[PDB]
């Protein structure tokens, strides 16, 4: 599994997720900074009041 990496809108970048890793992630939240887009290998847990989404294909978190 090969997934996008870079934060918000900085230039795309993508990391290779150690082996039996399925999912690449997306999360977004908002702080006192702006609104965050976190993206990487693996499925993380849930917390409260940031977003996330999940998929299992090929660089599919951009």
């Avoid at 900085?10 to 990391?15: C, D, E, G, H, S």
């Avoid at 499925?43 to 998929?55: A, F, N, Q």
Wanted: positive net charge; proline residues 6%.
């Amino acid at each position: 599994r090969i997934c996008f990496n870079h934060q918000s809108s900085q230039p795309q970048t993508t990391k290779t997720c150690s082996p039996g890793e399925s999912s690449c992630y997306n999360k977004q939240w908002s702080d006192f900074r702006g609104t965050i887009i976190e993206r990487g290998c693996g499925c993380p847990t849930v917390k409260p009041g940031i977003k996330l989404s999940c998929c299992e294909s090929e660089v599919c978190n951009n």
